Design a protein around this ligand. Structure first.
Ligand SMILES: Nc1ncnc2c1ncn2[C@@H]1O[C@H](COP(=O)(O)OP(=O)(O)OP(O)(O)=S)[C@@H](O)[C@H]1O
Ligand SMILES: Nc1ncnc2c1ncn2[C@@H]1O[C@H](COP(=O)(O)OP(=O)(O)OP(O)(O)=S)[C@@H](O)[C@H]1O
Ligand SMILES: [Mg+2]
Ligand SMILES: [Mg+2]
Lengths: 129, 258, 319, 327, 254, 258
């Protein structure tokens, strides 16, 4: 069991951040959890990989479902992220600050107390590419 | 079969130096009266054509012509083992998958032998040389190299203009313009430095400097260079060998055509 | 004019660890370290202008005495700090023989450690590990996350925080007493308000106001330095009626020469860091601001786009 | 000769007394230089406010006529990387002057296009060499500069040129040139400037060229509007009135005839109607929300092309549907 | 007008080799007593100053001074056509947009002629040379080049220190330190190898090795190099020509 | 202490040229009978070992051995000040933090002195040389260099095969294969060109061409090169000095091992 030095100097594996984005703690303020997650997503600098992780995980996550609209609202964000990511190669990277907001929409929409188990993930996109 | 022995590996190395860089694939063909080779660059503005007669070799035997194609780069990679003074023998059977280069020193001592993989190229030798050209001129090849090296710096196009008793090379680009004017003259103190010119019709053609730069390499094979120009066909720059010649045919720029 | 005078940030730059009005805990820690010796590898992180470089400079000076010239190796971001430098010069300095007191060590100060390449940072690990008995490393950075975890594992971590109102007020009062400047309470309050925990910026604004008007008054401070930009943007976004926000944007920001890019970007920051409203409405406002940011980056940056962004934010806040 | 330069370049201020509009910063900089304490300056402001002219006149007043040799002026046109900093800026700061004795000046004009690594390397050059040299950073956007570099310099915000200063400069130009200007024409000129002296000088030269006369006549509003292609307040208010009150077909015909009689652009009419409707005291803000949203959408669509007639009809319908909620 | 014919194109080529790399723009001015040229690098720590008197030419005619500025790189690009033995004639009218370089071989044979585009540079020649320097020394230029080439490897700064009868070059950096100490001496077996030193005051200045490296190029123009140092001004390194000289003024470090 | 004066700085410069590139750190040790030095590359397939006896120096004094380690690159950077004809003196105290290189011209004139920073290296000199090798051969080093330079172009592996009275170098790669066969012979017209071979057992080993290329540098120190091969240990290539030698021990490729 070695992890103390990691907590001391290492960040949050993007996978751990994805599993944390689908978890809500019932004992903490939702706003404090949101700012903690925002800081973790910003410190990682790899918002794209976190979002791709969220995209692969969301169909397998338990989320109180009314008509699966939550997925429809998230397709519009994901489309907003793809436009932003295309614009990063055309324009000086001022737009990079908004990239951390798209992963946090998953915490708002799909974050549930039911999601206690870590879902492992893979990279279907590199294989598909 | 192919069986050609060069007295000095150096001659073959300089010949290949001429095809070098400007072309990738070369098609050789040995036969009863010698060896010929042709290579065309990708844009098809330059043709490199070689002819080596039987007498240029120390030993040559051919009872059955063989055509073989190969990658120029692969060949030159192997063409620095000749020690220049080494003896070089090119060898191949009648239906080859490879070409053997055999370098040997006078004594039995050291024998470097290579087996180069061949490429299949559709045999299609061009015969674009003209009966008469508008103008013909020869001058020392080192002089031609300098003329080309001067002007090249100024533009990607070098114009050659010929009028009675006058040959003028011109380049004009961003930093300015330049010109080299030479006049025909017979030097008896040594005629290898003379500049001959036979003009049937004034000519004025433009060539891509990058190509003329490839062509000047022939200086290493001959003291003089012959230049034949026509408004009807590619220009011919020729470097004579003892029993043979290396020729470069270059298409004039149309306005933009190398 | 022939020559200038030294600025108050450089002239009154602290040379002893007691003159630092920063974080008291870390300051007393470094003071006791310099008193006892055995300085370990350290990484000081924080925000610009809070006393990080001055702190490590004072520590090295007090710890080395007169041997500071030949025992301290300073490398800033202005010098080459690649793999080759770490391989040759840092290793030669760490391997260099030097007779020091039995409580001191050679110090390698690396300013702006967050800018060193990954190769140099990786090579520095064994460099600081094999010579940890005669050479010590002190990094000064703004983002501790930019330094690799192996390097952070071999050193102490000192996180400097913002300077409270009392500390900056005390330092400014000391500077005024040392300079005999005419001031007033509201002027110092405006200076500290425009400083935002930045001691260097506070001293710079104080010196500029002194050299421009002589009397440190809130009117002078406000006329020579505009109000904190983010605060007007926050007041514009937190407006209850559309006309008030429009008038604020027109008079305070647009009529004073603030570019639309600065307005929208400052706007994004204010929202991200907002805490008055809920999370969902904040995300919707950020979405609208970012759509305006998109439009602006394409060259369509005008007042109409910002007005439409404010209208959409109010419509979101309109339930 | 200076008679060949354009009016924007010909009338460039050479002394600090020719820089109008900026008074609170100009006086403060003059006091800084006279008393000696000149800190690191950060001139932040919109284009055409006079930051480059201000710093050039300042360096001229400081070093004399030999300014071009005692000052290191770098800009976006020159290669400004981290190695460029390390070599050039550090060698300039560490050494002294070759022509006289005194502090040095490094003018980093348009430093908002510098790399983050360059600013990270320069922020310690400014702090180390601060007794023999100074730094002046000119910027249009303060978001492209790192906060560390932004905190080491004293910030001066160049406000847009007000009416008095721009009219003073216009009078100076009308004195320097054999030209006359109408008062209402001058007001219309100030209206289409937004505090940009470059635009004023350019359009003044252009309307002087439009005169077609030996300049014995005056320049009226018609000349300015026909030369800059800007719509007149009369046609603007007529189109707005026909949109707000008249019929759909009549409004379409009015907009078409107005935009085709003078060759006006739809974007200029959009901006003019936005500026006019900003003073309208309206009812519940829903109408303003709809109006602003639809007008910004139409402007963003025009910024990429399309059918001008379709976009004009869209503007008409958007304004009409927005005002239909005010009843 | 400008009309200057060099006997050997080689002299001009070596002179330009001296401006080469260390400067981008050069301002030439021909006049009744010859040609001068000045070039300052971007950081303004090095000034390259040339003077060629009328006698250095095979033919020189000037009834009206002409000032012309040009890009050094463009000039050198064209300066490899001289065959060294070719004759070179610089030609320009009184209000030029270009400078003509005309290379010709003895016989009418080959004539290479260039028309180089000029740049407009505000005429502002500097006159920073001092009456007296703290110390003055000359030594073979090949020796000076070696001294510079040695030390350069060790540091980006090379210090020159002068005391009575002693000249010492020093470099100290990462891998260690180095020094070259030379002493004044008259060699009658051939005085072009002597090392002279006149010291009015001990000097100790530091220079950027990158610049000294640019300066050593002058070895190709003269057997000896003169070095004049002062604590009040840029150092002067001078390479004499037959009727003329190439000078490099270098500002010391801090 | 260390106090070794070379008559000509050139000898030391050529010796260091031999360690150059192929190794980064060198461990020197001076003692009563001379100076030795060892350097091993990172992959540990090559060991460079030097021995310079007292007689190779113009002046040598040692009353107390000193071991010192240093970066090869730093040393060569400084090793181009010798003028070749300059005198070179290596100097160091008994507990050095640096090594002093002192170059002086005959006359008092110019004195270039360097103080090189040392590295601490755990003293651990290897003694891997064998009593007997399977085969031993010597031949002109320029010839060995050519043999290596030929074959290198063809492959990253060059095989050395020895049978009675036959030495054969072979390379085989993409473009083809090559071989150089040499035979033992005594040339009385000048025996420095002879090729000796003593074979106790036929050998056949493969070496990484990149390493043989590093090794050929020794040609500049000696006219001949001795090559000792064994199937039990690294091969030894040796270049004799007047009182001394430079040795390169190279581990054969296992199948893939340099
Ligand atoms: N605690 C403090 N007490 C007194 N003066 C301070 C203090 N902190 C900062 N200053 C002043 O600010 C100047 C610069 O401080 P620095 O230590 O360089 O800032 P910083 O905290 O290192 O942030 P950087 O350098 O931008 S990453 C000093 O020279 C002082 O004049
Ligand atoms: N305050 C002013 N007074 C007089 N003329 C001015 C003033 N501001 C601008 N101008 C004119 O506008 C021209 C351009 O001024 P600049 O200083 O280059 O603009 P700027 O403020 O630097 O903005 P940039 O260069 O686009 S970042 C000057 O040469 C003047 O002719
Ligand atoms: Mg700092
Ligand atoms: Mg500007």
């Amino acid at each position: 069991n070695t992890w103390a030095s990691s907590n001391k100097d290492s960040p949050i594996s993007w996978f751990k951040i994805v599993n944390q984005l689908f978890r809500k703690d019932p004992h903490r303020d939702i706003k404090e959890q949101f700012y903690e997650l925002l800081n973790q997503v910003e410190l990682n600098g790899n918002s794209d990989r976190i979002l791709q992780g969220c995209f692969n995980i969301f169909p397998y996550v338990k989320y109180s479902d009314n008509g699966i609209r939550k997925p429809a609202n998230i397709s519009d964000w994901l489309f907003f992220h793809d436009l932003m990511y295309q614009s990063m190669y055309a324009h000086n990277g001022e737009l990079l600050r908004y990239s951390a907001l798209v992963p946090l929409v998953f915490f708002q929409t799909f974050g549930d107390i039911a999601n206690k188990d870590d879902i492992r993930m893979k990279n279907s996109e590199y294989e598909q590419r | 079969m192919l069986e050609a022995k060069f007295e000095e590996a150096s001659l073959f190395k300089r010949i290949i130096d001429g095809f070098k860089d400007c072309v990738q694939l070369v098609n050789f063909q040995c036969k009863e009266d010698g060896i010929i080779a042709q290579a065309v660059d990708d844009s098809r503005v330059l043709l490199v054509s070689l002819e080596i007669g039987v007498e240029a070799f120390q030993e040559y035997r051919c009872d059955h012509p063989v055509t073989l194609g190969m990658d120029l780069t692969s060949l030159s990679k192997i063409l620095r083992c000749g020690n220049n003074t080494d003896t070089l023998t090119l060898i191949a059977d009648n239906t080859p998958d490879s070409i053997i280069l055999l370098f040997e020193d006078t004594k039995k001592d050291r024998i470097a032998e290579y087996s180069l993989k061949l490429m299949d190229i559709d045999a299609d030798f061009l015969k674009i040389e003209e009966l008469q050209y508008d103008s013909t001129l020869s001058l020392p090849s080192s002089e031609f190299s300098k003329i080309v090296r001067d002007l090249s710096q100024l533009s990607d196009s070098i114009n050659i203009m010929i009028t009675k008793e006058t040959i003028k090379f011109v380049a004009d680009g961003d930093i300015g313009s330049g010109s080299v004017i030479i006049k025909p003259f017979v030097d008896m103190e040594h005629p290898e430095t003379s500049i001959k010119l036979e003009m049937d019709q004034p000519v004025d053609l433009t060539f891509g400097a990058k190509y003329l730069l490839d062509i000047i390499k022939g200086s290493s094979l001959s003291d003089r260079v012959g230049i034949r120009l026509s408004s009807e066909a590619p220009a011919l720059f020729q470097f004579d060998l003892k029993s043979g010649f290396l020729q470069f045919f270059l298409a004039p720029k149309f306005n933009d055509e190398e | 004019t022939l020559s200038l005078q030294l600025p108050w940030v450089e002239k009154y730059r602290p040379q002893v660890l007691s003159d630092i009005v920063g974080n008291k805990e870390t300051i007393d820690r470094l003071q006791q370290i310099a008193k006892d010796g055995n300085m370990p590898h350290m990484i000081i992180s924080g925000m610009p202008g809070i006393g990080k470089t001055t702190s490590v400079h004072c520590l090295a000076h007090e710890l080395l005495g007169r041997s500071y010239a030949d025992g301290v190796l300073e490398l800033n971001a202005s010098d080459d700090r690649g793999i080759d430098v770490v391989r040759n010069q840092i290793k030669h300095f760490a391997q260099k023989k030097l007779h020091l007191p039995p409580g001191k060590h050679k110090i390698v100060i690396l300013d702006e450690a967050d800018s060193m390449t990954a190769g140099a940072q990786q090579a520095l690990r064994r460099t600081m590990e094999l010579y940890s008995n005669s050479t010590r490393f002190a990094f000064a950075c703004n983002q501790s996350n930019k330094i690799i975890e192996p390097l952070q594992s071999r050193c102490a971590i000192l996180r400097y925080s913002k300077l409270s109102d009392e500390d900056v007020l005390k330092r400014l009062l000391q500077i005024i007493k040392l300079e005999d400047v005419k001031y007033t309470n509201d002027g110092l309050e405006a200076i500290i308000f425009t400083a935002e925990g930045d001691m260097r910026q506070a001293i710079n604004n104080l010196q500029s106001t002194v050299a421009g008007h002589g009397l440190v008054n809130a009117d002078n401070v406000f006329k020579i330095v505009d109000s904190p930009h983010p605060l007007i943007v926050k007041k514009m976004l937190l407006a209850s009626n559309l006309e008030d926000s429009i008038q604020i944007l027109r008079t305070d920001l647009w009529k004073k020469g603030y570019s639309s890019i600065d307005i929208v970007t400052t706007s994004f920051r204010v929202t991200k860091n907002l805490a008055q409203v809920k999370e969902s409405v904040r995300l919707e406002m950020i979405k609208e601001i970012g759509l305006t940011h998109m439009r602006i980056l394409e060259g369509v940056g005008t007042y109409l786009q910002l007005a439409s962004m404010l209208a959409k934010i109010h419509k979101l806040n309109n339930k | 000769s200076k008679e060949n330069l354009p009016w924007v370049e010909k009338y460039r201020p050479e002394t600090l007394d020719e820089v109008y509009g900026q008074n609170e910063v100009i006086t403060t900089v003059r006091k800084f230089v006279d008393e000696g304490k000149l800190p690191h300056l950060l001139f932040y402001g919109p284009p055409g406010t006079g930051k480059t002219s201000t710093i050039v006149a300042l360096a001229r007043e400081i070093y004399g006529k030999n300014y071009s040799n005692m000052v290191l002026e770098l800009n976006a046109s020159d290669d400004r990387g981290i190695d460029v900093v390390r070599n050039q800026i550090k060698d300039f700061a560490s050494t002294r002057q070759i022509f006289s004795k005194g502090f040095k000046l490094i003018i980093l004009d348009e430093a908002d296009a510098m790399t983050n690594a360059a600013q990270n390397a320069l922020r310690r050059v400014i702090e180390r060499y601060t007794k023999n040299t100074r730094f002046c950073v000119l910027a249009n956007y303060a978001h492209k500069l790192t906060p560390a570099l932004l905190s080491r310099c004293t910030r001066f915000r160049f406000q847009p040129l007000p009416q008095e200063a721009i009219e003073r400069r216009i009078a100076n130009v009308l004195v320097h040139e054999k030209l006359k200007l109408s008062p209402n024409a001058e007001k219309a000129l100030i209206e289409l400037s937004n505090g940009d002296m470059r635009r004023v000088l350019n359009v003044l030269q252009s309307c002087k060229a439009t005169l077609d006369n030996p300049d014995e006549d005056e320049i009226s509003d018609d000349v300015i509007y026909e030369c800059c292609g800007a719509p007149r307040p009369s046609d603007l208010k007529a189109v707005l009135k026909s949109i707000l009150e008249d019929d759909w077909g009549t409004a379409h015909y009015t907009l078409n005839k107005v935009r085709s009689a003078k060759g006006l652009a739809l974007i200029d009419l959009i901006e003019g109607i936005v500026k006019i409707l900003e003073d309208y005291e309206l009812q519940n803000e829903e109408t303003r929300v709809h109006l602003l949203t639809k007008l910004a959408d139409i402007e963003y669509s025009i910024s990429k092309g399309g059918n001008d007639q379709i976009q004009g009809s869209a503007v008409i319908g958007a304004i009409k549907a927005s005002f239909e909620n005010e009843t």
